[PDB]
Structures are given as structure tokens and as C-alpha cells.
């Protein structure tokens, strides 16, 4: 009923050179399907074409085939693509079934050639509208259905289903741009038929339970203000001010944000990295009981054994921890994986024992997985899931949920995250991830195959050498490709779908004589309309998601080796990078691409930046004061602003966040000493290097550029 | 360029009986406007019709009139409706201008009757597409423009502009339902052309500054997780754990939520109310220096004079404080109005000195106004503004902003709140509020005019007797209509647009012999598809917003006196309230509406509920422990669960929230004693009364209904 | 849903010599009602004609009238003929209600002259299909609904929903005569 695809197509596939009366039959119900309830139609010669189309277009919503075109193979493939898809086999009184389908569960019905044709046309339409109703998840379906009502409300939201946008001109332009339905599904608790999110009521409860069942979770919660909010919910549930928490040193901005409002003391788990500035794994040693007890003794406050653990898995650049090996070693009852970058983890075999929800909670221990559903699944931004496992307290976590969830949640986002769960439900999800995985691996192999053919220099991939078999490849001490120190046997895996491209300039995780900085590649990808996830000094991160077709990757390939063409060409910066040229044409007057690149590479070789960034994040500065209490001193006022140089031997009042590499260097309350001088040297270097060449800049969040230009940091008391 | 209204109409208005060659001229450019760039057209007889249409339809985007139809009046009225609206006056070489337009600034150009007609059609199209570009606010326009690009991205969000929803069927149904553009404008910071929200960069800054200028604010911040989040931002900026805060006792759920994670002690400002359970104003006395200093001495913890003040203005039911009179009396430097229910306040004269932003911050004192833009303007849910005033610290509030704002904000919501500012910009906003105000007053006057004619009983309005003049009427001690105690001269105003309907049953703010409970009216409004904002035991709240047409109010009128018709009819509960009847037809077998209603009224008269609710919220229970520390005890575990009866003499661990009236009764950490026995009596009464009649229920958030049904509350230690 | 009169007619009655933009409004939703879900339309000059027609034809299933043509008498008579019959009054931002209707229980909704016309056309269609569902008695409605299912039965009666009449010629003539 009025809820269906945009391009509703029904695929007629009967073998060409049918009988005359069977052709008239299938065409009568084709016209009938068109002229009643506005369908679209394809005609094909065999079912093999349909399975091709289904892997690209999913707005086909029925298959009616003459029995001649019946194919055992296609039905096996259609089975593994869409079990609910309506199928119709038209046959006369002559032929019985193929036995393969006894077991196979498709939505097959059988028509007989006869007088009644428009009857079948109505029969087909019904089983289609059933298919359309029976594919939305509960709350989404409920929400969508409500939209079609006409309610005449005197309540919130104030736009009251769109009527408020119509009164003004700019309102009308906004309304038309975004579409009727987004406003008609913008409801509040004042429309009681859906219940509440914070209450987990009629519709919402059904949605929350659905998601939990889908992700193999004991209990799941939907969050409409990003994983940043989900992380804080977990914390304020697990942690009361006073006890100690175990923190991944390479954690999200939001982890610190949580620490900053509860009087809690962290010990950080020292992770590895390479000269590229790629986040590595926390070695197993750090998780051991003895390492924890010792680090507690050495911390300043350090109440006792941590009640709370937060480890980011996977890393931004796609390294995966074995979650089984971690839980075996971590005797912390509230341990929380920040799995923002792997909501798909639980749906593919290659991630066996690499997602939180895969482990059985140890007796009276609680597991938390926070996932950013929008980050790598199909959902609206700000939409996130909170999966928990084991014995838990609804009475108190509901309050922790209420602490951060708004009282007027935006229902389309609620629907969107539930719908993303329904996308992953069943072997539907497996194929969805399998595609993006196979595509990524193809891009990896296709790029090194180009490196072989390539003359002179060429790009490279941050991956093992042998990637023949399709797995999340395991890092090994032996191989120097990852550039990490002391990695354990069978602990770290590489996520195939996260492709890090490497530009010449890093030999043995240190500086290089000749190179080509990544910044001059990123800009060239930007000139040719390509958006990169992250750009290192010599690396480049592309994330192949379920929204990445092979065509996109061919575009990426073609522009990439074109950059080499135009760089070996040594074309003018004007003709090659017009945006960079336009920033200062006086400076780039007759400059060519090689001059610009080599001058940037020279200044990094002169600054000795790679191993500076190495030793900067490989030391951990003396923690003087609780991040919470450091922020509190900002409020209370006891803090003074002194230049970056004078940060030495003082206690930082705010977080410092340099780009590159886009990683917290120091948290609020920590202090730099002789031991941790490395980080301040790296910072002061970023200043000089960030100025020199126009168009290539540096940023450090936390300090303040004054009138005089000098950058002061606020230090405590 | 490809950004325009849906029904782009251009109004031709030339006086009937034109000249033959002038007729053909205007028609040649009408056809040209239709067949090129797909315009729609109206023809009218005089400009007076146009001003009528413009006040109902704002997708007319040009007016081309023959000079005969020129009207001095209409052009003054069109001026006060849309100055940017393109106007075209076609005239021959015969007539000079009317002088009125010297002052008036319309978008008038002048055409001359001649050969070149299609030229003018192109000239008209340009000045229209200029109008379409020049009405969106900066970030919204920038966001909308980006949608039209084709970027081939390998970044977040994972749906990558919608391409991820296409791979699956349920994805496609979700994608089609909501529309292409909502996904193409779902961006991240990874597309650097817009900058960041938390950074307040190129596009965002322009939007943030625009809003601040629009609402007459020193500095404004946009919030994408509701005012609930905005409130917490304000708090964690203004408050460090240890000092005391001044709280409106009738505050939002979110105010407490803020208190629960900062170690802060509140003193509550006792507000008034009536038997109906309508939230009243805090009397001026409570704000005085002596009342504050005294209540501090009397509190348990009470560090010192509060650094932070939070008062909710307006009330849920539309009572307004004089913000000037408050700031004069409250020597608290960080004072924060929770103006969720009045984002429109600053745009209409009747709210003079009733909004925060209207007062000059006292030297070194900071003012905060948090507004729920979605609550009573045209914006998406979760969208809220944070307006501040005076000397402030960006370096620290940026951290407070970052503490609660997600790292991946949903850009359409960002755009939506900025667009809502642009809707209010200029006298555009004045007329928008003036309409909803005049409509409200009309509904009020027409309803009491119906009460006069009405036979026997009828509804009433919670308003003064004399409402002849169009003002925010001021409450007076003398008049018994508001039922409040000790109201000050010129302190409390009634917001016209918030209509509270009253059903018989409350005589002199106490019980009544005969009545008709509001619940049996709400259900009847629900049966007839009408959504109420809030329902009291004998009241009903309709909020007339800018999304409320007169047709809605006539629908509301017609169903209302129909309820009286069917109640005086004494129709069967089956035929009158089928949903209620269906819940238990065994019980309502042959019951009529009067029996059901009178039995409910009798049980409230027997329970003595109205004055029970009165004395419940008019006492304030002994605060035993900080709300923060009470919640912390849940985490730490020191808490036991005992039934509601046994809450007496114990310290509550969680907030209790009864419906009715939908107001916090006790906060975490407070304790009931003999003095505050009233509230627990009211609670235990709500149990008995909530059971008895089927379909009419009661709810109390905070306790827990067990297996046996009995409701335990968790009490501390 | 697919259960309705044969001649589904919707009576537009707006006073001749309407305003130009109000004429286009009611006609835009008249065409919209025709071309989507196949309605039939009458145009009349006053409501007095409608009460005449209702006492002869009961396949009119909605009345959408401009507020000019509002009539106190006809609404009292329509009340005593069909309380459930959908009524729609289109009016601009100018006029409040006549008090007679306070007591009278019709199926009146109110439209406002504005941009959104096809929206109202969808709003009208919904309140009509509600009227069509809400007039059959329980068992009749249940029986009628079942007919629209496709069940593939192996039970009694032996004709199994008509399929048995199709196999023979005389069967087909009997089936066609009496109807699916």
C-alpha cells in the first residue's frame, strides 16, 4: 500500500521463440502490471542475466518466467541473493518440478497458462506488496506508515509535519530540497503510537531487540548523537569518580571527553607505530596482569586495579586485535571496545574473534562494543550502536543512556540505524561485506601489478607481500612491511578494506634522499574530484565501504598513475595543480610539479620529521593531574597562558592535537619533562615547517595563535 | 541554477480588457517562461488578489503586471511581506512613476512594450534565479550546492552519498522513501570545503555568526543533540565541582542530568502552581539577595553564593518572566534561561523584556539562553541554539561544546537550525509570529464566545477575563483565573500562543461534585485524529505554532463542541470511544460515555487528587545528598531496593517523575520525612487510582514494577 | 483498499464566480482525484442540490465545497442522511465557523487555500477509503476481505474459488454471468 521502490521493475524472462498463446499471456499480465499500479518491466532471454542485474540493481521486485527459461543454477544464485524475492513460473499442464528447489526456499509461486491472466496480474501484485511490507524493520516500518496519516497536530515539533516551512520562502526552498517524507516522519513522544527512545517503548523496544539479535548481542542500544555519545554512556555506567581506568593511549577524542568530567585516573596502554605515523597495536605484554599492577604502582593517583577498560579496535588504519586473546588476559570486568571502524566485523568470517560481541563474557564481567554505524555502514551521520554483553543493570544504564540522549530524538536517525541492522541481517550482510572485501583486495593486487610494470618510481600499498589468499592478514615480527616493533604471533590482523597508499620517501622507517610527499598527491586527487579519508606525510588512506563501486576504484587507479605521468612529465604547477597555483601565482610563477614536490621533501628531510613523529608518540609524558581536574582548573580559573616553548616542565591545561598525524600528543593534566622533550621538539618543528611552503600547512589544536603570531598554551595554576 | 521551488509560479496580473498588442506581449513571455525552464503561471485581475495569495502561498517567485494594474496599496503590503520578491511593471512610452516607491525597496524592474519579448522572458528568468540563490543562509546554501557535485569519495559516511543504500533491497526502500538529497548532503569534515562544526570553520563560522546576528546575541552556537545537550554545555562551562548552583525547582530532566555528573549542590527556587498542576512563576521574593543567602545557610552542603543560575522561561504552559526585573535582582554572574519554549521570543514586540538576549549583561556577568529551535520554530528535531551574552571565554567553552557535540554532526540538522534563523531574519520573522499570535487569540476569543452561547457546561480557557487588547497578558494577584499564590505586580505574563483548555471539575482550585476528566476528552480528540501536546487531569495544552493553520483550529473547534454534543448525547463508549471500548469490551459492554467519565471523576474526588497534587509539589523534601553523589552510589553499588511505601524516611537514589503532572517530584539524593510526607501520599494514591479504571492509566518514572506487581524504589546505602 | 463503489463520485460544489486562484485550487485536486485512484466528479452551484442527489444516489462518497457555498440547512439534512459521509470545506484565512455544527456530527475536515493542493487530494482520498472500510458490518467486511487473498486451497467447496468452473465451457458461461 503506497510503500514501494521508486523504479518498481518486474523482470519477465521467457525464452525467445515462445508459443504464440504463451507470449500473449505473459504480455497481457505485463500490460496489466503496467497500467494498474504503475510497474516497470524488463524482458530478458535467460535467468543468467537476472542474477547479473541483481548484484547491481535491487529495485527489481519480482521475476515471472516461462518454464522454458527455468535454470537450476540461477535459482541457486538467486537464493543466495534474495530469498524473499517473488518468483513466478508460468507453465502449461505438462512439466513437474526440478528437485533442487525442494530444499531451496525462494518465494516461488506457479502460474498455469489459461484464460485467467489479469487474475494472475492481481495475484502477482499482491505477493509483491507483501514483499514490500515484509522487508522494513519494525520501527522503520511503523514510522514510515505513520507518515501517510493526516493528524492535525497541535504539538512538537513546531513545524508540525512541514506546515511551518510553507509559510516562508526560505522555508519552502528548504522543504522542497529535502523532501516531504523527512518532515512527516519527524515525530515526538507526543504521538504515543511509537513510544519513546529513552523509555525503550512499543516500537523502539522492538527495534532495539531486533538490532541486538542481528549483531549477536546480549542487549543493544541505539544512539542518535554519534559514537562519541555512546562512549560516554558506557563510561558513566562503568565508572564512578575515584577508581582507576585502563585507556588505549591511541583513543578517540571522546574517551578523554569522558575522563574530563569524572574524577578518574587513567593508565594508558602504550601502542606501537611506524615512521609513517600509522597507529599500531597494543602488544599483548601491556595487557598482562603484571604490567597493569606495575603501571598502577607507578601512576600518581592510581586507586587500584581498573574497573574499566577502553581499547580502540580496530585502529583508524585497520589493524585488528584478537578479542579472545585480550579477554583471556584482561581481568577487567567492564571492558569496552571502541569498534567505531568495524560495525561490519561480526558479519564476515575473516573477522573471526576480532569483534567484541564474539566472546562470551567472563562470569560477572561486562563487555561493551560501541560502533559508529554511519562510519562504515549505510546510515545517517550521528547514528551509532551500543552493544553490551553479560550481566548488566538496566535500571542504572538506562540512566546513563538518559544522561546523554536528548529528550527529542530525531526519528529518521533512529530509523536509519535500525535499517542498517536490517541491511546486515542474514546472509544479505555477508554478501554486502564480501563485495567490499573482494573489491578492496582486487584494488590492492591491481595496484602492485601496476607497480611491477611501472617505470622508475610508483606508489605502494601498506600490506604484506603475499596476499594470495583472502584473509585478514596477520602481522609478523619477521616481515618489515608494517614497520612495527615487538608484535606478537597471531595478535594483529590487517583489515583488507582499509587501503593505505604509500608514496616514495620512507626507506627503513626513516627519512629518504629523494621522495614525493603525499600532500602533492592528495591535492592532485582533489583537483580531479577524489576525497581521501586521511593524508599522512607519505601515506594516503582510502576506505573501501559498501558505498564504493568498482567504477570508483578504476577512477582512483586512472588518476593515480596519471599523477605519475604528469609528475614524470614535470608539468607546470599552474597546469597540473591550478588550485595550489592560484593560492599564490607570484610564488609559483613558472614552477613545475617536481620543484614544488622536491622542495617539500627537502624540508621534511631537513626537519628530520618522520623519526621525530616516531619518538614523539613513542614516549608518554609524566601525568601530573587527572584530566578531569585539569579541565576543572580552567573553569575555576587557576591557569596561565605561556608560549609553546615555555610548555617545557609545566603542566598542560588542555589537550594538544597535532595534524599530522591526527593523534592526541598529550592530554590535559600531563606534564613535559626531559624524558618527554621529544614531543615538544616535534611540535616546535611543526611550526617552522608549516609556514615555509605556501599551500602546504600544519595545524596543532589546543594552542592559540596570538596577535604577535606566537602560539601560547595555557598551563595550570 | 537548478535550485528552486517545486511549484515555481509567476503571477501575471494585467487589468482585464487590456490592449490587443499588450495582451499578446504578456502571453508571449508567459509561454516563453513556461516552455523554457518549466515555470507555472497565474493570471489575476488586480494586485489586491496577490497580497491575499502571498500570505498563504510563498512559492510564487515573480510578479509581472501591466502598468494599469499598478496599485499603491499592494506595493506597500508586498514590501512588508517580501522585499526581495522580483516585480516587473510592463508599460508603454506613456506614464511616469508613482512616488510611493521612491522610499519602498522592492525588486522592481520595468519592461517596455516592444518587439523584444523573449528577451524579457530571459531577463525575468535571471532575476528569479538570483532571488532563488539570494534567500538561503550561507552554510545551508553551501551545503545544498555541494550536493550537485559528483565527487567519487573514499571516505565517511560509509553510504558515500547514497551509493551504499542501493546495494540492498531494504536499503533501497529506505533511500527512496526519504529522498536523494538528504543523503547527498550527509557530509563529514573529510570534505574540507565546509570546515568543521566543532572547529567553527569557514562555512560553519559564517552560519554561527549569522544566527548570532539574527537573534541579537553576542555569540551563538548550534547544537545537534537537542537543548538537553545545550543545557549541559552551559553548565559544564559555568560550573566546577564544589560551588553552589541556583536551580528552578520546575526544571527540565536535563538540568538534573547535568547536576548528576558534577559535584555541585543546588538550592531550588520554589515556584507556584494551581490545583490543575500548571507550572507557575518563581515569585520575585525568591530571587532577592536575602532569600538566597538565607536558603544557603539552611541547605546541607551549600558552599557559598551560587555561581550558576538556571531558570526555565517560559514555563511549559506559557508563563513568562520579566528578564530585566530578574537580572536586576540576581547577582549571579552565570545565569542561564532555559528558553526552549520561546525561540521566537525576540522577534515580536509583545515579548518585550521577556527573553534573555534582550538584557545587557551586567559588567563581567554572562547570560545564557538555550533555545529548542525545533520545539516552536521550523527545524528538525535535535536542533537547538545556544545564545550567550557578555564577556566569555571561547578557549574553555569550545571545550564545553566539544564535551557534548559529536565529532560527526549530521549536516542537514546543522543547516536546519541556521535556516530557521533565516526564516526569522528581518520583518519576515515578525509577520510569522504575528500570524500564530493572532490565530491563537482568535481561537481563545471564539471559544469563550462559544461558552457564552453554550447550554449547560462547556470547556474554558486558562486566560484572563478581558483579553481585548493583543498583549502577553500580565498576571495579577486580584484575579483568581490563574490560581497562583503571591504573584508580583508586572512580573508574570501569559504567552497567547500556548492554549490551555479546561474541562469542568475544578471550582476554586479544589475538587468538584460533578465534572468531566480531561482524559475522556483527550481520547476523543485522539479518536478524531488530533494530537495534544500535554493532558492534565482537567486541562489540555494545545500549542499554536507557525505550523498551525486556521483550518487546524477550526477542526479543533468542531471536534471540541462535538465532544460536548456526544457527551450530552450520552452515547455508548463503543460508538464514541471505540479504541477505549476495544481494550476491554467485557467491561464496557453497554457502558455509556457519562458513566465512564463520572466514575473517573468520582475516583479523583474520592482520592482527593487535585489538592493532593497541589500540596505535593508545594513542599520541598529534605535534601540528604548531592544528586551527583547519589547517582555515584548507584555505580559504586551501595543501594538497596525497597517498595514505594517504604520510601518513607529513606534517601532516594533515583529521580521520581509522576505522570500527571509530568514534573520531577524528588531528585536523586533527597529524602522524604514527615514534612514531605505529602508527596509519598500522592504517589501511593497514583497507584490505586491508576489501576482501577481500564484504559485510564498512571505512570511514575523511577520505581520498578516487579513480578508481583509491587513497585520498589532503590534507596541509598 | 480496492473496496469501493462502482461510480465513486466526489461532489465539488463551489459558488460560481469564485476567485481565480480558488478555481484553480479546487480543479487541481479534482484532476488529481480523477487521474489517481480513478474518481468521478460532479460540480454544482449550491449544497441544496446535494441533499436532492443524496436521496436518489448514494454512490457519492465525498463533498468538497468552497466556504462561500456553506449552508446551515443542507448540513442539518446531510447529518440526518449520512453522518459518516466525508465533507471538506475549503476556505482562506478569513472566516470562522457557523455555530450549528457544534452539535452536528458530520465527517467535516477543513482545507485552506495554499500551495499544497495534491497533498489535500491525498488527504481527501484517505478519508474516503476510511469511509469505505467503516460502513460494512463485521462478517460481511471479513468475508469481502478474504476474497482478495490468494489461498491455493485443497478443500471444500469443490469449485475452490472458481477454478473448477473454468475447466468446462458451460461452467465458464455460468462463472462469467454471475461474477468473480
Numbering used by the authors:
A (entry chain B), B (entry chain A): -5 to 711
C (entry chain C): -5 to 174
From the paper:
A previous report showed that a F. novicida transposon mutant with insertions in cadA (FTT_0406), which encodes a putative aspartate aminotransferase fold (AAT-fold) pyridoxal 5′-phosphate (PLP)-dependent lysine decarboxylase (hereafter referred to as LdcF), was attenuated in mouse spleen. Bacterial AAT-fold PLP-dependent basic amino acid decarboxylases are grouped into a superfamily termed LAOdc because these enzymes decarboxylate lysine (LdcI, LdcC and LdcA), arginine (AdcI) and ornithine (OdcI and OdcC) into corresponding polyamines (cadaverine, agmantine and putrescine) while consuming protons and producing CO2. LdcF sequences found in Francisellaceae strains display a high level of sequence identity (83%), and contain four functional regions, corresponding to a wing domain (Pfam ID: PF03709), a PLP-binding domain and a AAT-like domain (both corresponding to Pfam ID: PF01276), and a C-terminal domain (Pfam ID: PF03711). It uncovers the important role of this previously uncharacterized protein in survival in the host cells through participation in oxidative stress response, thereby identifying LdcF as a potential drug target.
We were able to determine the structure of F. novicida LdcF from X-ray diffraction data collected to a resolution of 3.4 Å. In agreement with the relationship between LdcF and LdcI families disclosed by the phylogenetic analysis and the relatively high level of sequence conservation, structural alignment between F. novicida LdcF and E. coli LdcI dimers extracted from their respective decameric crystal structures demonstrates a high overall similarity, with a root-mean-square-deviation (RMSD) of 1.043 Å over 1,223 aligned atoms. Like LdcI and other LAOdcs, the LdcF monomer is organized in three different structural domains: A N-terminal wing domain involved in stabilization of the ring assembly though inter-dimer contacts (residues 1–130), a central core domain which contains a covalently bound PLP cofactor (residues 131–564) and a C-terminal domain (residues 565–713), which partially constitutes an entry channel into the active site. The core domain encompasses a linker region (residues 113–184), a PLP-binding domain consisting of a seven-stranded β-sheet surrounded by eight α-helices (residues 185–419), and an AAT-like domain which harbors an antiparallel four-stranded β-sheet and three α-helices near the dimerization interface (residues 420–564). While the overall structures of LdcF and LdcI are very similar, some notable differences were found in both the AAT-like and the C-terminal domains.
